[PDB]
RNA sequence: CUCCAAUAGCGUAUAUUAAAGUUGUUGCAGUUAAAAAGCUCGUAGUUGAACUUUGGGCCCGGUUGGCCGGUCGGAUUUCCAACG
């Protein structure tokens, strides 16, 4: 069955639910047979948004995040209607290699793409996927906590304008860092 | 003659230390008092932008998230995450 060939080996029941959501468009197929055939994903984590909704995180192997970005906007519409009370987002399963200490040595020098401070930057670029980020500010409060601030492009913002409350919860669950989104005009 | 200072000790000479921020690492000065090479290149020497992840528990402050409005769009904070 083509449902089971997307997930890793066995798991899980939730991975099948999104798997059926793909083949209802692969078998409908206005144009999607030429682009949704090779697209496959790795896992779903369910993140509880602070409101009544929840968030779906789709993890992509990333030789194919560019492939997913072709149908990203259209596919999210056909995932939100057949999965109510949810917000669907697409992320890439990136690898983070630990910083070498003066004792914990390795072989094979660690590329800058594997550093943790670069992977978290690529999460923000991939959470919001349209509306390219036009800036970042970090507030160091008097108390001692740090609050980021992501400035988004004003054009095409109406595709994610409701999902700013969801994105702050997702990035907190993966990084533990506070985010506020601000849209300059 | 009287008085002062130290006193079984007191003066003199030379050296040296403090004084001396008058050798300056701490810590000098260089327009006119002494002192910015006529100017530029240049080796040694001295100096050189930014960037690469947060596991023990308990008490304290916030800042977000709600269970909570008390109230005529703002007014108190507590029990709970983790967020450093």
Give residue A2's domain range.
Answer: 1-185
| Count of domains observed in chain A | 1
**A17 in contact with nucleic chain B (CB within 7 A):** no
A138 touches strand B (CB under 7 A): no
Let me know: does A167 contact A173? Beta carbons within 8 Å.
Answer: no
Q: Which nucleotides of B are covered by protein (CB under 7 A)?
A: 51-54, 61-66, 82-84
- Residue A97 gets the label, from left (phi > 0), alpha (psi -120 to 50) or beta, of beta
The residue assigned the tokens 């896992």 is: A43
The Cβ of residue A98 has, within 10 Å, a number of other Cβ atoms equal to 11
Residue A130 main-chain phi, psi, to 5 deg: -70, -175
Q: Which nucleotide is nearest to A175 (CA to C1')?
A: B54
Nucleotide nearest to A179 (CA to C1'): B64
CA of A176 to C1' of B14 (A): 80
The CA distances from residue A49 to A57, A103, A169, in Å, are 12, 41, 6
Bridge partners (DSSP) of residue A149 are: A137, A180
Question: Exposed (0-12), middle (13-18) or buried (19+): which is A80, by Cβ within 10 Å?
Answer: middle
H or E element, residue A174: helix A164-175
With beta carbons less than 8 A apart as the criterion, state whether A71 and A106 touch: no
For A59, half-sphere exposure in the C-beta direction (CA atoms, 13 angstrom radius) is 12
C-alpha to C-alpha distance for A91 and A41, rounded to whole angstroms: 10
In angstroms, this model's resolution equals 3.0
Give residue A167's Cα distance to chain centre: 9
Distance of alpha carbon A29 from alpha carbon A22, whole angstroms: 10
- Chain A 95-114 residues in 7 Å CB range of strand B: 96-99, 110, 112
């Amino acid at each position: 069955a083509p449902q089971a060939k997307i997930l890793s080996q066995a798991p899980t029941e939730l991975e099948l639910q999104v798997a059926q959501a793909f083949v209802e468009l692969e078998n409908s197929s206005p144009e999607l047979k030429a682009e949704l055939r090779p697209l496959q994903f790795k896992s779903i984590r369910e993140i509880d948004v602070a409101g009544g909704k929840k968030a779906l995180a789709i993890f992509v192997p990333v030789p194919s995040l560019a492939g997913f970005h072709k149908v990203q906007t259209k596919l999210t519409r056909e995932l939100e209607k057949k999965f109510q009370d949810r917000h669907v987002i697409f992320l890439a399963e990136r690898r983070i290699l630990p910083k070498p200490s003066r004792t914990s040595r390795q072989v094979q020098k660690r590329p800058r793409s594997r550093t943790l401070t670069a992977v978290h930057d690529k999460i923000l670029e991939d959470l919001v996927f349209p509306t390219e980020i036009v800036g970042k500010r970090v507030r160091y409060l008097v108390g001692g906590n740090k609050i980021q601030k992501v400035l988004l492009d004003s054009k095409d913002v109406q595709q994610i304008d409701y999902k700013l409350e969801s994105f702050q919860a997702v990035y907190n669950k993966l990084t533990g860092k506070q985010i506020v989104f601000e849209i300059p005009s």
